[PDB]
Design an enzyme around this catalytic site. Structure first.
Site, PDB file in Angstrom:
ATOM      1  CG  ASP C  49      -1.910  -1.148   1.170  1.00  0.00           C
ATOM      2  OD1 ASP C  49      -2.016  -1.808   0.114  1.00  0.00           O
ATOM      3  OD2 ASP C  49      -2.566  -1.389   2.197  1.00  0.00           O
ATOM      4  CB  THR C  82      -2.067   3.910  -2.319  1.00  0.00           C
ATOM      5  OG1 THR C  82      -3.196   4.734  -2.009  1.00  0.00           O
ATOM      6  CG2 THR C  82      -0.904   4.336  -1.491  1.00  0.00           C
ATOM      7  CB  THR C  83       0.585  -0.168  -4.532  1.00  0.00           C
ATOM      8  OG1 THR C  83       1.793  -0.810  -4.959  1.00  0.00           O
ATOM      9  CG2 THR C  83      -0.604  -0.863  -5.175  1.00  0.00           C
ATOM     10  CG  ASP C 380      -6.881  -0.818   0.978  1.00  0.00           C
ATOM     11  OD1 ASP C 380      -6.723   0.313   1.483  1.00  0.00           O
ATOM     12  OD2 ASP C 380      -5.936  -1.504   0.538  1.00  0.00           O
TER      13      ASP C 380
END
Lengths: 509, 508, 517, 513
Positions: C49, C82-83, C380
């Site tokens: 993440d 986000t990644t 998430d």
């Protein structure tokens, strides 16, 4: 924080964790050779290990991937007992594979993929080599005696195992289908011989207050207590430690005596003939228990007062918070008796029938704690062996069996999965190399013959590191219980598969 | 790798011969002194195995194994400190190659530790039984070893006193190990050699009894590990006077401890009292101990603990650290206890006769001066040691390293009889015995190279006759000039080599 | 003083960025690989993440510092990408760089990326469905909350966490706006159970003060008394010893506690619960004497907690003993005392229907790192629906949408021409890099599996089926059940296409000579 | 191992910089090269279309491009740089695609697929124009001749190029009017004004002096026969020691041969092209001047050019010794004409003869060979671009301009293929925008104004058009009068495709000892 990408971490993963799988496989087998223990940073004093868990606990390693194995080592060693040096090497065995596979362009995703299914293929072949022995008590007797001391083989002190495992199987023979290792009171206590290590039927205390408290009692009520005496617990019988005025500090002692003395009463008034305290007992309440017919044992064993609470039916006093109110330990027999050189306080008539005290007697504590280290891992397998009474044929036998099984499955799979799965059962074939090469005998002879033997399939002829050559697994005692294997087959490929998903390593160190 | 471990164990194999070689040309008195600089940087002149390894040393695991070797020889014997270090590097040559010769080091060890068994089997077979109940045959191979060795002068006086202690302390026919625990080495300052004595009760170092009885019969042996002074804060007594109105109030309860425990000594009754030192115990009230003495108990005030230890276990004076523990029963009962200024100068409490666990004798080393007292030590002790070896393994054997060379000859052929992958092992093993007398036939001078050649053949020929005379250092008889190994002096060093070696060969 | 020129700064901004971007692209999907974190202390932790692991990563280089800051706003609304932003933010990066090295201005194609970002957004917004509902979302949420757990913590579906993660949202989703926020429900990590052991709570919960277990554990009313004031005599984190003028005065001291217990129990009794939540942990020797007066006090719990559990009910905390008031006391729909873990004591479970400003999913785990990444899972699965609450909306793909998103931007490049054609060249391909870079960390050719859906996008449009994040043989972004809010993908684009432009901000790369130290 | 990549990269590296140093092209760009060689020899070079061949480069792929430099020049004769300028345009994608996870094989057909689709679109931008049209000949020559050496004498050369082709024209959109066919001969003297198109075969030989035939009635040359004489082919036992007997041998040798050359003129021969071999001396210098006494045009050691063209045109074979006379294998000749314009040059002109419906022999003249080569290479490449328009009837954008049109449109086929090589195509489909901006390379200061525009100039012009690279100003790249047949550009792409695709298979380290 520095990002380790694939090969950076992964080579660093191999070099440590496979070598971590090496000096432990150097210990793999009883003829896994002795490793002088050279400690890292402290304790230059050197034991010499036939079991790699020591090295893992003794020697710290900077490789984080190798920092994982010691824990997985301790997973086995604590949870599963034996399988400790073994869970580390088979991962390294699977890591040696991924040495190629990564540089051989195989992504560690795939490297897990086969090993995902392949793990059961060996499990299932080892479920096939899983056959219930111990289905009878005499079986169970010798099925314990099989894998009880087999746990003690690589573990440095396999010799007193003669007396030890007999003790170890008897206590678990006494368990009779209900595994209780707290009903087995484990006392490692110096004195006498190591073959003088003992199993009491009852509870026991290595703590002896002395003979100034009643030594033997029948129909004795044991108070199980954190109750303090000079410690000044609740419910004032007379001034405890405090200053309420000029002379109030003086009113403490004499009325603290009365407080100690009525902390005889509250404790005594249970009707006890024994007061076993996990905390201090002041000498006046002590001796006033000795004058009450009560045996007051000071700072008696934490686990003992706990097992005395478990095995004898005792409740802790809630630290005198039950001055009169706490359920007693009740053991019809009090014996202050010398096992070894030391008088130990034996408790029989305890609540539990499986309640036993195994007294491990050091002629030296280096073997004694080693006896205790060899004690429980057996007992770990034993409780397992109790719940699942069964074996699997060790010494490479089921290894090569699983090897020839999973590989021929890796031969019927062979998609991306066999790339792992051929890499998988080769480890099942490579560990038979380890013990035999520890035995100092050609594996390429034996293994590749053990191959043929298990390419014919085999439950019997397997590599006997005792003989150093291929030999029978009939349940000869080198045939392992299905207990550890399934756990190692579970636990081992993990750390491999675990590092397989994380090649990415972010290091702020 | 096993090779990095090998290179380690080679370094082990190597360093184990390294410093042990200073022992090898040190074998026997014909073996030579080695001036040894020390971690303090001081020359140390030593011919002996126990001293050299333990004096200046290093961090290598082999050096760890060195000090174990003479020591394990010492707890077994105290005799053969050097020889036990000579057998290591011998095997260390038998060991190293078998690796390089393609034999696995456990197979190498399970050879040598088994090769030991089969090997040292014939040692006792070569050996001869001697009577361990008879004082002479004891004293014989005791002094015959002492005739083979240095200590004679006060030994031939105190070697029978050794056996006089030994004869007393030998209950059985094999005489067990004659644990020197049944014997007590003690030293009086004043006095001469001949004052060296053997008392069934225990002689005690000094004594302090001020108003008390200097000699007391059927003596309850008191143990004060408690105090005669009320517990200390700023003083010996419990008296600290900051007020008189309080001092009258302090007067009341400080009167007991000096009275009670003192009287408790004779309340339980005591003919004797063992008391550790006023430094070893917080405070000892003399004003209490004087009345305590004057109660005609025998007080040894400020007595050493390790004699108390020997008093506790050997003559049965049971531990009293406390009033809860102080009874007439945990007191030893001394058939006689006496403060003795006799046997030269200076006081010693002597328990004379006692009810004792084991067979307890105190052999008090004595001499016109302190070294002559110290001359009396190995005068009693060395015989006790060579005895305790002769008894632990009953049979005696002709010594001098002939049984080394003797059975070195044989076990080879019997190794060769074994065949298997360990025949070359056990033969290398069997060979190692030859080098010990080699260095001996070296150190004694001239030709070791010849000595063992004929001998091992003479050991296929005459055996026990032809051997290594430590004085001659060549083909000779250890029977003609008497060199006797009480088997345990040999039987000790047998396994100790193989064991650490088996370990260090199994050591990675 | 160091002076970088143009690309030099950029090239210096290229170094770690792509390297950081490289670590993202092997994390993509179950095909991808997690990022282990060894701390500055050396603490070895498997993490993910990016903003999380980029917060764990120490950002020295400048562009990475926004990667923590940019990806922050990314995780909040979305929970994924986000990644994936640093992928494109790294992918779109050397897109411009080589163009800048082709002589293309930062003045030129940099607009074109955002200019292609909108049209890719505009294209994306068609792909799959901008539409969901509180019912539909559940199945996307199922295949979200199965895999969100079923990626991070386990790979298996854990339902009691799965739909309780989404229903926790759905519980406060309809509390506000038809929109929850990410604090408006909470994830409370503690391990008494396994992973699957959890507590869905419509208010916050704590482990009750227990001053001795044998004293009765009780819970009552619907309501709780949240107390700065005394519940019983308060103790202010300070010892109170035993001083009594007589030996009888100690036993006379005994009544003072118990009478002030029930008096201030009675004073709490009428107001709320009979139970405390007290900002003061009181004497536990006395507390269990009140636990002997029963009506358990919750004490020795944080001063922020009385604040917390109060406001979570919309209520207050009673400041003074004379200030005792039911509104100055907290609330609940049900306060219940329920065992934390199976074996341990009964934590006070405050389930708050008198208001829920946070509906707390309480979670248990076999271990932290699993309950952590089960928490980190929930977040998430909580974040993805925080998109859904606003617009109920999703899409299927990073290898379906983007290759399709690119496909519009693809020939749109030569539809651009002059400035941004090289942008929408370098934009479209950078989109298809993610299925490439995911096919990279897949067992497949990043070119061929990108070629796979390439042919498929030359065939199918707005595909529900695209390459494998779940690493299957078939690639169906609907039936891989890779499910990502079309808000998120859109927002991701907006966020991922953002940073690369931002390094162009003003003309000043000028440093005194320290741009990093 | 690493061995394949590096040298293959070096094949992409060392050849690229050479191919990158290439594009200064189309007119006034850069500064002149007065070239100290790798050996230090100093050499002036301009108009790098020729310098390509002239360039001396080592290394496997780098020397490959000079050998690839003629590839455009060998068949076509127009825009010789077109393959060399794109020799690095493929090496553009080479690095990336090897680094992209794309196999050299997948890169191999990538060149093909990009070549396949490239020459396809070029046909759409090929405007077909009449194969025999005087203009499409003249203007193709002109446009070339405009770029070639002479821009004035073009008006002479272009129709002579037309007239030379239109004579040998085999009107087709396929191969016709070969280079072996048209015979381009050089004559010292005259002028490029006096460069003469000659329909008939004109042999360029070294003719002894004058007083020889400029006139009609000649039996053609190409004779290999020696003249047998005493002291030539005949035994003389006269011994040479004394000077007088050494004198007696040459006189019978010299007196006899003059009858032989009469027999040679008796054959009707006013011309002999004499074999460059020698049967003994073959024809001696006695025989040769005796041939010149008979007005027989005679060259001992004749060039191979007039040996084959006289076989190709006049149909001529050697004839035997003239005592043996002839088989009359000498082809039909009538006018044997040595043009002396100010006496400069020896030029054998056969007006009327056997002819293979072909071989115009154009006499290229001038004050000097330099003036001659001003016309010759120009008329040749004028013939060539005409030949190219006879080869391929069309005119496309000249000077590499259409590749940028092909750039955008091949990027569309980057999508249509949708393959792994579609990316490869894509990388190269944008690698054909390089040349026009790069042609501007080498001249001067404040550079960048040229670059992305020439990219965009077609891009902004959709798929239609952009500025001309050789002319200038916003217009159609295709219709300029900078125009070349479709052959030239589809040649270049076909040529660089293969040799650069060999690089993909270039691997390890292997060297013939």
């Amino acid at each position: 924080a520095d990002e380790e990408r694939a090969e950076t971490a992964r080579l660093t993963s191999f070099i440590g964790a496979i070598a971590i799988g090496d000096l432990v496989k150097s210990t793999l087998g009883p003829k896994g050779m002795d490793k002088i223990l050279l400690s890292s940073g402290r304790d230059a004093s050197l034991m010499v290990t036939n079991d790699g868990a020591t090295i893992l606990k003794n020697i710290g390693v900077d490789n984080p991937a190798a920092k994982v194995l010691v824990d997985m080592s301790r997973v086995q060693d604590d949870e599963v007992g034996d399988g400790t040096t073994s869970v580390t090497v088979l991962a390294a065995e699977l890591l040696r594979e991924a040495e190629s596979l990564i540089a051989k362009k195989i992504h560690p995703q795939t490297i897990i993929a086969g090993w995902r299914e392949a793990t059961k293929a060996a499990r299932e072949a080892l479920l096939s080599s899983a056959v219930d022995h111990g289905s009878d008590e005499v079986k169970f007797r010798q099925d314990l005696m099989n894998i009880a001391g087999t746990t003690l083989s690589s573990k440095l002190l396999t010799h007193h195992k003669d007396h030890f495992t007999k003790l170890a199987v008897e206590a678990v023979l006494r368990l009779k289908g209900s595994g209780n290792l707290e009903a087995i009171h484990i006392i490692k206590k110096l004195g006498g011989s190591l073959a003088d290590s003992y199993l009491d039927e009852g509870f026991l205390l290595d703590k002896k207050i002395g003979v100034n408290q009643p030594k033997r009692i029948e129909n004795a009520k044991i108070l199980i207590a954190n109750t303090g005496m000079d410690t000044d617990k609740i419910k004032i019988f007379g001034s405890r430690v405090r200053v309420d005025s000029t002379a109030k500090v003086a009113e403490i002692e004499h009325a603290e005596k009365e407080k100690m003395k009525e902390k005889v009463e509250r404790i005594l008034k249970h009707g006890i003939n024994c007061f076993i305290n996990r905390q201090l007992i002041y000498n006046y309440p002590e001796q006033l228990f000795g004058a009450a017919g009560v045996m007051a044992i000071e700072h008696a064993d934490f686990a003992g007062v706990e097992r005395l609470a478990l095995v004898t039916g005792g409740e802790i006093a809630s630290t005198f918070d039950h001055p009169e109110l706490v359920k007693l330990g009740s053991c019809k027999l009090i014996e202050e008796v010398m096992i070894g050189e030391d008088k130990l306080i034996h408790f029989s008539g305890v609540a539990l029938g499986e309640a036993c005290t195994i007294v491990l007697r050091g002629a030296t504590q280096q073997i004694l704690d080693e006896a205790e280290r060899s004690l429980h891992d057996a007992l770990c397998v034993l409780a397992q062996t109790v719940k699942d009474s069964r074996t699997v044929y060790g010494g490479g036998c089921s290894e090569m069996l699983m090897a020839h099984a999973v590989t021929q499955l890796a031969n019927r799979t062979p998609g991306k999965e066999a790339v792992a799965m051929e890499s998988y059962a080769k480890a099942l074939r490579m560990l038979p190399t380890i013990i035999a090469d520890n035995a100092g005998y050609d594996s390429a002879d034996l293994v590749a013959q053990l191959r043929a033997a298990h390419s014919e399939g085999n439950t019997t002829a397997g590599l006997d590191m005792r003989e150093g050559t291929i030999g029978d697994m009939a349940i000869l005692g080198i045939t392992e219980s299905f207990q550890v294997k399934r756990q190692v087959l579970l636990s081992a490929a993990e750390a491999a598969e675990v590092i397989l998903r994380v090649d990415n390593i972010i290091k702020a160190a | 790798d096993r090779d990095k471990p090998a290179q380690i164990r080679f370094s082990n194999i190597s360093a184990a011969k390294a410093v042990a070689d200073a022992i090898r040309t040190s074998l026997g008195p014909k073996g030579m002194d080695k001036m040894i600089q020390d971690g303090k940087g001081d020359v140390t002149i030593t011919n002996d195995g126990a001293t050299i390894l333990k004096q200046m040393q290093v961090l290598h695991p082999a050096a760890r194994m060195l000090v174990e070797l003479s020591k394990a020889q010492d707890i077994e014997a105290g005799d053969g400190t050097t020889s036990v270090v000579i057998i290591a590097g011998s095997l260390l040559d038998s060991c190293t190659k078998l690796l390089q010769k393609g034999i696995h080091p456990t197979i190498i060890s399970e050879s040598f530790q088994k090769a030991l068994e089969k090997g040292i089997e014939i040692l006792t077979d070569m050996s001869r039984p001697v009577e361990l109940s008879d004082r002479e045959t004891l004293l014989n191979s005791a002094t015959t070893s002492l005739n083979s060795k240095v200590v004679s002068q006060y030994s031939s006086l105190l070697s029978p006193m050794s056996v006089n202690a030994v004869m007393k302390v030998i209950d059985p026919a094999t005489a067990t190990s004659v644990d020197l625990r049944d014997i007590k080495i003690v030293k009086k300052l004043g006095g001469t050699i001949d004052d060296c004595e053997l008392v069934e009760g225990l002689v005690l170092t000094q004594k302090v009894s001020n108003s008390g009885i200097t000699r007391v019969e059927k003596a309850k042996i008191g143990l004060i590990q408690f105090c005669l002074s009320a517990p200390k804060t700023d003083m010996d007594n419990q008296i600290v006077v900051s007020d008189y109105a309080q001092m009258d109030r302090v007067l009341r309860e400080e009167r007991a401890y000096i009275l009670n425990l003192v009287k408790q000594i004779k309340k339980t009754g005591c003919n004797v009292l063992l008391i550790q030192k006023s430094i070893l115990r917080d405070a000892l009230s003399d004003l209490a101990l004087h009345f305590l003495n004057k109660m005609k108990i025998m007080v040894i005030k400020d007595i050493e603990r390790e004699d108390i230890e020997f008093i506790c276990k050997t003559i049965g004076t049971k531990p009293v650290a406390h009033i809860d523990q102080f009874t007439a029963d945990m007191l030893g009962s001394a058939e006689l206890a006496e403060e003795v200024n006799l046997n030269g100068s200076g006081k010693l409490l002597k328990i004379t006769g006692c009810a004792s666990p084991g067979k307890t004798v105190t052999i008090v080393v004595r001499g016109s001066n302190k070294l002559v007292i110290e001359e009396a030590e190995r005068s009693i002790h060395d015989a006790l040691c060579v005895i305790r070896c002769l008894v632990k393994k009953r049979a005696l054997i002709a010594g001098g390293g002939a049984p080394e060379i003797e059975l070195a000859l044989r076990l080879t052929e019997y190794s060769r009889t074994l065949s298997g992958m360990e025949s070359y092992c056990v033969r290398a093993f069997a060979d190692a015995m030859e080098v010990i007398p080699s260095t001996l036939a070296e150190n004694a001078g001239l030709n070791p190279i010849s000595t063992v050649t004929e001998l091992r053949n003479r050991h296929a020929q005459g055996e026990k006759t032809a051997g290594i005379n430590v004085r001659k250092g060549g083909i000779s008889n250890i029977l003609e000039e008497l060199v006797v190994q009480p088997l345990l002096v040999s039987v000790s060093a047998l396994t100790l080599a193989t064991e650490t070696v088996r370990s260090i060969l199994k050591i990675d | 003083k160091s002076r970088l020129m143009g690309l030099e700064a950029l090239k210096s901004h290229i170094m770690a960025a792509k390297a950081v971007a490289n670590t993202m692209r092997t994390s993509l999907g179950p095909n991808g690989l997690d990022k282990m974190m060894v701390d500055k202390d050396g603490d070895v932790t498997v993490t993910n993440d990016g903003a999380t692991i980029l917060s764990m990563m120490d950002v020295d280089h400048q562009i990475a510092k926004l990667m923590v800051e940019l990806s922050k706003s990314q995780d909040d609304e979305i929970g994924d990408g986000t990644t994936g932003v640093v992928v494109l933010a790294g992918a779109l990066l050397e897109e411009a760089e080589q163009l800048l090295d082709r002589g293309i201005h930062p003045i030129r194609i940099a607009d074109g990326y955002e200019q292609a970002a909108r049209v890719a957004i505009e294209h994306l917004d068609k792909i799959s469905d901008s539409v969901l509902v509180d019912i539909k979302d559940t199945e996307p949420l199922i295949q979200t909350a199965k895999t969100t757990l079923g990626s991070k913590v386990v790979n298996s579906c854990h339902r009691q966490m799965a739909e309780i993660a989404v229903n926790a949202v759905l519980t406060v989703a309809d509390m506000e706006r038809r929109d929850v926020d990410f604090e408006l429900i909470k994830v409370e990590g503690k391990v008494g159970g396994r992973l699957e052991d959890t507590k869905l709570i419509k208010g916050v919960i704590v482990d009750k003060d227990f001053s001795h277990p044998q004293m009765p554990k009780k819970v009552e009313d619907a309501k709780i008394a949240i107390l700065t004031c005394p519940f019983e005599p308060p103790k202010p984190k300070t010892k109170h010893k035993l001083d009594v003028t007589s030996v009888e005065d100690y036993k006379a001291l005994q009544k003072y506690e118990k009478e002030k217990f029930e008096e201030m129990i009675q004073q709490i009794k009428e107001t709320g619960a009979n139970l405390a939540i007290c900002q003061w942990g009181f004497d536990d020797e006395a507390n269990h004497l009140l636990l002997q007066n029963n009506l358990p006090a919750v004490r020795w719990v944080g001063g922020p907690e009385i604040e917390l559990i109060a406001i979570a009910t919309g209520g207050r905390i009673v400041p003074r003993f004379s200030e005792l008031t039911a509104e100055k006391l907290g609330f609940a729909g049900l306060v219940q005392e329920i065992s934390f873990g199976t074996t341990k004591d009964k934590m006070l479970v405050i389930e708050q229907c008198k208001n829920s400003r946070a509906v707390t999913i309480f979670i248990r785990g076999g271990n932290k790192m699993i309950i952590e990444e089960a928490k980190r899972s929930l977040h998430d699965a909580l974040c993805v629906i925080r998109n859904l609450i606003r617009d109920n909306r999703v899409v299927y793909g990073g290898g379906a949408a983007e290759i399709s998103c690119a496909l519009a931007v693809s020939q749109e490049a030569d539809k651009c021409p002059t400035l941004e054609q090289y942008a929408m060249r370098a934009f479209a391909d950078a989109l298809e890099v993610i299925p490439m870079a995911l096919s990279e960390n897949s067992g497949m050719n990043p070119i061929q599996t990108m070629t796979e859906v390439r042919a498929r996008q030359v065939k199918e449009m707005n595909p529900a089926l695209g390459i494998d994040c779940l690493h299957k043989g078939t690639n169906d972004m609907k039936q891989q059940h890779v499910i990502e809010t079309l808000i998120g993908k859109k927002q991701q684009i907006s966020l991922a296409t953002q940073m690369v432009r931002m390094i162009l901000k003003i003309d000043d790369i000028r440093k005194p000579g320290e741009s990093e130290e």
